[PDB]
Design a protein around this ligand. Structure first.
Ligand code: L9Z
Ligand code: L9Z
Ligand code: LI
Lengths: 237, 237
């Protein structure tokens, strides 16, 4: 496994020259730029397209992933489910997007999720289907079943982010992703959050995961480190 | 856990000034200098004492560990068991030694091992009781039982080094050391060898282990990295 390094950013509507300078300073470390958008209250596809245009010089160095992380999965986004899913579907129309995050949880409308995913894939977008538990790390068998349900949508990536309470929870997440990687077709990404889980981010490739997320400024999630230091780590394993 | 970094050396009877200079150049990275001696055919306590003087160990720089690794546990040492154990016991008489490795395996004479360990401890030596499997990684429960048997001798450290052939084997070693660390009094050290196991060496402290072994020149065991890079890694977790 060669792990791709994802740099998470979270600008308001007007992306600042100072952010552009920070990205450029880390350019060799960035395989994917993750534009978070849930922090933009009442964000529209038009506004997203405007932001993407400003990040079109370094297009040649990285893929662009757009993520709207809902409040209930630990982000800022307060859209109702229908507005959220309408946003995700509309992102297909932006040419400069390469990857799109869509959230999985137990209450989703399956056939609708599959219609959206098919739609994004028809538009040549890579789909990351994601699930987050900021409270705890379910037991091994449960983490595996979550991976199982997410992969039935035939995404390009399945991503599971969980919060460890102890060392065993960290090892369970690593085991879940390792067993998935050895047995299943699509790419997997596991994150054990917080300082305790940092090893999941640095040794992600050892256990067969495809992406690791870091930051440019402050951590955008518990345990994130700067992408320059993250790239150096990934290269060691 | 603050992990101590061990630098493994394996010189001939006459230690060359060039080695001493390499050690001194890495003094900030070295908490323990491990003088391997099994590579000296028919080595005596007198010859070990001569080599120790030749190191000219400076006050307050690193602890000195002396290790005779037997051929059957993956070293070079061809001593019969009685000669081996007589060597281990005689090491107590060398003032400059701080720590001594003694090997555990299923067929040991327990009461004799305990007599020797008590003896070393009466001489103010820290005892590292160690076990190595260069072939494979036993299952979790077996790794735990090995740790259990080794700790009954009330050593200062229990050390288990095993060879992974897949991701689950690496995770099993990490789980065994973590559970030991959480439940038992004495210090624990775990090594999953080879490149696949490198994470056990760099994230040792995450899982509660007390030592991590690296090299000066060439790797002295599969997966070792240079102690300067090892110290930097330990500091990240
Ligand atoms: C995928 C994701 O939730 C992982 C977070 C992390 O823990 O690094 C960062 C988020 O920006 C990201 O969408
Ligand atoms: C403890 C020990 O057997 C571990 C080896 C390793 O895998 O780094 C190095 C040996 O010198 C050492 O005694
Ligand atoms: Li690392």
């Amino acid at each position: 496994t060669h792990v791709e390094v994802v740099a998470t950013i979270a600008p308001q509507l007007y992306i600042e020259e100072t952010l552009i300078q920070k990205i450029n300073h880390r350019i060799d470390a960035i395989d994917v730029l993750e534009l978070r958008i849930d922090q933009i209250e009442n964000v529209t596809v038009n506004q997203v397209a405007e932001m993407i245009t400003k990040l079109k010089v370094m297009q040649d160095s990285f893929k662009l992933l757009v993520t709207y992380r809902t409040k209930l999965q630990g982000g800022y986004g307060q859209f109702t489910n229908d507005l959220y899913l309408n946003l995700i579907s509309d992102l297909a129309n932006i040419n400069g997007i390469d990857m799109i995050d869509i959230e999985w949880q137990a209450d989703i409308d399956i056939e609708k999720h599959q219609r959206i995913i098919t739609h994004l894939q028809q538009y040549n977008k890579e789909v990351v289907i994601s699930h987050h538990n900021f409270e705890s790390t379910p037991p091994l068998d449960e983490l595996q079943f979550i991976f199982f349900k997410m992969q039935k949508f035939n995404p390009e990536y399945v991503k599971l982010a969980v919060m460890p309470h102890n060392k065993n929870d960290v090892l369970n997440l690593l085991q879940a992703m390792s067993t998935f990687s050895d047995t299943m077709d699509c790419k997997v990404v596991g994150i054990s959050m917080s300082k305790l889980g940092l090893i999941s981010r640095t040794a992600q490739g050892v256990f067969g995961g495809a992406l690791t997320y870091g930051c440019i400024g402050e951590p955008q999630a518990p345990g994130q480190i700067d992408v320059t230091d993250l790239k150096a780590q990934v290269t060691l394993y």
